[PDB]
Amino acid sequence: ETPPIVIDNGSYEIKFGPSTNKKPFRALNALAKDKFGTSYLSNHIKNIKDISSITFRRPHELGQLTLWELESCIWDYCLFNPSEFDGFDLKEGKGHHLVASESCMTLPELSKHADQVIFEEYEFDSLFKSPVAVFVPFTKSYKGEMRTISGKDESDYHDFQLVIDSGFNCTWIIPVLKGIPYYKAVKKLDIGGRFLTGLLKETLSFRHYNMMDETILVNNIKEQCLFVSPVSYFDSFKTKDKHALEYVLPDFQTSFLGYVRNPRKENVPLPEDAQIITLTDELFTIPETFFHPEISQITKPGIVEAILESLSMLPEIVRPLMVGNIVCTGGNFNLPNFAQRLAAELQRQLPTDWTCHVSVPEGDCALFGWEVMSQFAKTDSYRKARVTREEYYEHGPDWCTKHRFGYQNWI
């Protein structure tokens, strides 16, 4: 089997798909049960009617994934269903190859569980797991559309790359030199989608009734109507009376998901009996906790403090080279005006002789990471980088995760 399977393991959503297809198959990674006791599958969460009382139980914790039974059952559902996903099917998978993605700071024992489950259970011939930051130097192997933003302005892989990957779990800043991550300068940002979602449930619980019981509705509002301040919090706060968005709640008898209504847009003249929630301050208050954590009362340092500390641990020759090549991946970078704000606030702290450039791809960045992650398999270095099955059967189970797939060898 020549084309392998590209599976990106995440906390919110696991993106799987073959190497031939251009776009991955989106499937969630959770197990939701209702208050009545009915348990639904992860892809069937969007099909149910009532989103009021939903208990979310997922095998992925904040650090890593601990339970491989529910995650392995999700893998059996996504890989073993030909009728659920159009065109995709797999009979056994003994000759197929797998490209997986794990965390950079994962535990070694859970990685032994991963290599034993994937290697022994699924009978893969060769597998190469690596974090998402290592696939980022392989962007230049193929020609693609990627927007470049200059902060100062008003083989095929490259050595110097700076990877800032925001996620649902947390945000990681991983510097990459010679295609290898430098783990002494990696910084962790604890701000993620759970803090924006829970913070929006707290602010909406103070301005209105407590929406903490419903997480999918606040997740949809946070995905739809949220935007980052382009200039500052003060200029966006003086324009909070002109810029406002009105969200109508989805009534369970009529509509499963709500709709965002703009007061400038007269395209929705249909009246309804439901009430509308006004959103003025929470539009720009929620994404401002990355740069300024004083608004959310947390003692976190901030994103650019971890960027400057991440550049502080690097050698002085590699400091002005990594700031010229910055690629941003993840779902939190899909918010508008976040790249120019991050490049501007990063430009206001860097020295004059160094010029900062931030390259953010068009569209969703997680699908971009799956696309370049699929373009890594087409590279000829993957044939030398892959580990055979008989080599794993010869060596111990701890050697393959400790030496080649481990961060401790690169330290």
Q: Does 10 bind ligand BEF (CB under 6 A)?
A: yes
Query: Pick from ligand ADP, other proteins, Mg ion, none: which does 235 bind, CB < 5 to 8 A by kind?
Result: none
Instruction: Give the contact letters, 165-184, x = binds to ligand BEF (CB under 6 A), - = no.
Output: --xxx---------------
Site for ligand BEF, residues 14 to 33, rule: CB under 6 A: none
The residue range among 153-161, 164-172, 198-206, 400-408 that interacts with ligand BEF, by the rule CB under 6 A, is 164-172
Query: CB of residue 224 vs ligand ADP: minimum separation in angstroms?
Result: 7
Query: Pick from ligand BEF, Mg ion, ligand ADP, none: which does 331 bind, CB < 5 to 8 A by kind?
Result: ligand ADP
CA–CA distance from 303 to each of 186, 204, 314 (Å)? 12, 25, 17
Site for ligand ADP, residues 348 to 377, rule: CB under 6 A: 366
β-strand partners of 399: none
Altogether, the residues listed in the chain come to a count of 411
The residue range among 9-17, 86-94, 138-146, 341-349 that interacts with Mg ion, by the rule CB under 5 A, is 9-17
The residue range among 70-78, 140-148, 204-212, 324-332 that interacts with ligand ADP, by the rule CB under 6 A, is 324-332
Q: How far is the C-alpha of 29 from the C-alpha of 60, rounded, in Å?
A: 8
Closer to Mg ion by CB, 15 or 222: give it: 15
Query: Pick from ligand ADP, other proteins, Mg ion, none: which does 169 bind, CB < 5 to 8 A by kind?
Result: ligand ADP
Binding residues for ligand BEF, total number by CB under 6 A: 5
Q: Does 124 bind ligand ADP (CB under 6 A)?
A: no
φ/ψ (deg, to 5) at 21: -75, 155
Q: Given the rule CB under 6 A, which residues bind ligand BEF?
A: 10-11, 167-169
- For Mg ion, the binding residues (CB under 5 A) are 10
